[PDB]
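Recall from the previous chapter that SMILES is a line notation for molecules. Here it describes magnesium ion.
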Amino acid sequence: TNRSTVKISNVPQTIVADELLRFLELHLGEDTVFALEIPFARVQFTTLEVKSRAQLLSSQSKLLFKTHNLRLSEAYDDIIPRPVDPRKRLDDIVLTVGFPESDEKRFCALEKWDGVRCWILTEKRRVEFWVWESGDCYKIEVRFEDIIETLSCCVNGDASEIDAFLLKLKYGPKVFKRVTVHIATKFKSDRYRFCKEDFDFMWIRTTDFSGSKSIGTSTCFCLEVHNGSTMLDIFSGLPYYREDTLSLTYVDGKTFASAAQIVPLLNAAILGLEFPYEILFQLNALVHAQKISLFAASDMELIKILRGMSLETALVILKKLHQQSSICYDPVFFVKTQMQSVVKSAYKRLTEQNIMSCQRAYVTPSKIYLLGPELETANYVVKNFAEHVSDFMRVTFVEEDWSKLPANALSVNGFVKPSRTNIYNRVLSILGEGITVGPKRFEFLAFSASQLRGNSVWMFASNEKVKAEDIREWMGCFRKIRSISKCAARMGQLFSASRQTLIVRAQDVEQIPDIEVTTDGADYCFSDGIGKISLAFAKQVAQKCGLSHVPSAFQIRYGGYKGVIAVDRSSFRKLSLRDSMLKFDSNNRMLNVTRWTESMPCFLNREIICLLSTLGIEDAMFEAMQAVHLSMLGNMLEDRDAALNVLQKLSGENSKNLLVKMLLQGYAPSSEPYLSMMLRVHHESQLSELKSRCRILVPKGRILIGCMDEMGILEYGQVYVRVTLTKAELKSRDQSYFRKIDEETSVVIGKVVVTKNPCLHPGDIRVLDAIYEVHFEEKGYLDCIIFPQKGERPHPNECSGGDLDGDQFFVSWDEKIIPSEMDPPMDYARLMDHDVTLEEIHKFFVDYMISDTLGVISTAHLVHADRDPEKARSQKCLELANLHSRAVDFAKTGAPAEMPYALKPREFPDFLERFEKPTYISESVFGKLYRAVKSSLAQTVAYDVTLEEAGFESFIETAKAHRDMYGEKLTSLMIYYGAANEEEILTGILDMKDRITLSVKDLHKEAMGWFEKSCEQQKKKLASAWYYVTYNPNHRDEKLTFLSFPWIVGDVLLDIKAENAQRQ
Ligand SMILES: [Mg+2]
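With both inputs in hand, we obtain:
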């Protein structure tokens, strides 16, 4: 319960471990100390009886070495994780990994290991098995969440009822390797040495040590323990322990041994002509999800039954097999039952609805996890190659728990050289040789920047029609690119979502030169990515995007000139691009607009709050703004303000949202059940965000796309910010921070704080001056901060490392957070002849995994910023800001940003919900916001529908089938991914693709709803909407529990409600 690791009190640095080893011998029992640490010293004892006796002697205060007293304090983190309970440390056991081969009582002994040291750790929730395969030692650790079922087994004779203990895993263990340095053993106390049993060496994560790779291809661990008197262990401490002991007999698992370093959990080549894109992937998906066993899919019966039957029914039956949460030990029986009890548009929907059925694969450190076809937003590559959409595969590299791969897993990081571990080599080998799910071999083609951040890789099966290399030829990569950075940029440019604007003539594209100052040594270009566009081209681009207004600037990727282009009414050339926007060469002379300039609501971040506090904004100022935010959030369940205060701006909802529709012209949020539940979900999301990432909205502030003034009027330290006034801002206008330009928009006149999204170094917070230019009408910039054309240094450049390639700048006129003084900024300062190879791109991906994520670097900066007197100007914080800049620049220079141990957060703020880390209270630097958030958190309508929304007699009742079909589809989606009882598009938002899986059934319902409507439409569309409302609300006692079927036609329902209210 304490791990016997006692944090020693103040001790001198001139202390010998052998001295304390022998001194403790004269004070406690003989050889009764396990481990010892001296840098805040730690001593681990053998048991909890020898511990609490030193504490008893510590309370007696007798122990005093030399002239220094010892105050043995509370138990800190374990020096070496060992089970203090003598019984929990099981040694010399027989461990066999396998799967139940679809019988629930027979086990595939894939590989048997003898001498396994099973350490069942409760405080640190993990059971670590120490194996000794070959000549090296490996540790197999389950995580107490891997175990979905622990069973009491009887593998040998029935004389002993309890002989083995099964450990059914759902994610798969993390395998480590015993690697030593053979260095001097003393090192005073040393970190892992001084142990009684010589627990030296390091534990680096590696792959399946078994030649047969039995660890990966096994979903269960069997622990043949010598004694069955261990009921107390392997009990409710191990999750899901049934008391019903099962008789388990071993079977030969030699037929499932695969030596392939890729995809160790797939079916063998025992298929004649079976289609792998629709069964083998789905069968392997079932095996990985453990819905059926590996022998359940490799058996002749199921293979022959699926081969004989139709493919569409096969997809349906395999999906239904994947539906149930238990392990189907009789997939043949399930398939036969669904066959006998069968109860009897087009795949190219991405060309129209921009949604693909992608077959993603999470490649863990030692296992493959195929996840079948899943609906996500389509990208340009599949948009072009929809003929082979089933040949794509979104390969993601995870850490055996569907979590992000740690840098420690892929790199060792007391070491002389950063030697990459076996996980990095495995990822490189998989990216090279590809994933082979049967006949289809998925080999790497390219990845996106977000995919790089998400550790996701696309792989194409080399179909006979088009090879996986020809698509790379289409995308323009690996053709003539010379640098890995620009190769990755070109690869990612064709994956990010965008809108295809008008095709632009190459002759109409002017090339206006860049603006560079080149002062103070650094070469700084003012027009780093900002271009131009004519007003006519702007209007046609706007209507191409889908807007009725002309945005000030568009973030574009036209050809290779990636950047943002502003609307100049003086400009007559169509596109007037620049050289500084060039990233790669491309003949695709057509605009690809990602996002335009809109007045996106502002919201602070923990990094922005940290820097503003460091520059001199008191914590009592942020707390007041968060108090206003929490006041706005508390009454959203009880006031109509949520229509234009929470959903409109705090969340991603807009004027076309259904909740906004029924709140702008509807009743209170708590009146309607669907409205109340969706508003409660939004409330939970906003509170969780504000508690995690302090998105404190500033009404006097807007996050705006950076832009440059194309005329020389704006000077250094001066910016132009003309923003369309919000409704609340329209109500309270004509202030010192604004002046009326039009009936709708106003330009800031006062001081403005400007910083980029990362915003980690004190100095990116720039207190610029918002000035009104007499040329506001001539150029008409809107919802975009206008950086000066000339000056000592470009303002986005001194905003950390920002530039006008579409980077959004945090701009707020709110005087409360505007610093009195601004810190002077950081400096923010190779075409190898070997060209770009596929292996080089794989190495770039691997090294990006080596580099620590921007999120963890920002979190560590927060940790080191919440205690130091200089919050962000601290040496730790400045060095880690430089490291964060290196991590951002990794997309340009492939040097991983390995955060050192000195910069690692030893103890984490209470604001960050890091339960594994040792938390310290953070009442110093705006940690009061978390406490305020917690304090704020811890402070049918059928008749109404039939009256004010269903006045016209519908009497259709055709929506009952939809409620039994679309409701069935929603229940299927909830069973597949969801966990709550929500039936709306936010079902998975408790979410990356749940809004895509959902809102498609509603889109299917919308198609189904109009299909059942014969159109006028008052007798068809309104009738169907009223029938759905009556089916859901009036018969809510039925077995539907949806409350969202009428919301699929919710626009029509709200229109009918307004029409009935208009007639009244
Ligand atoms: Mg940028």
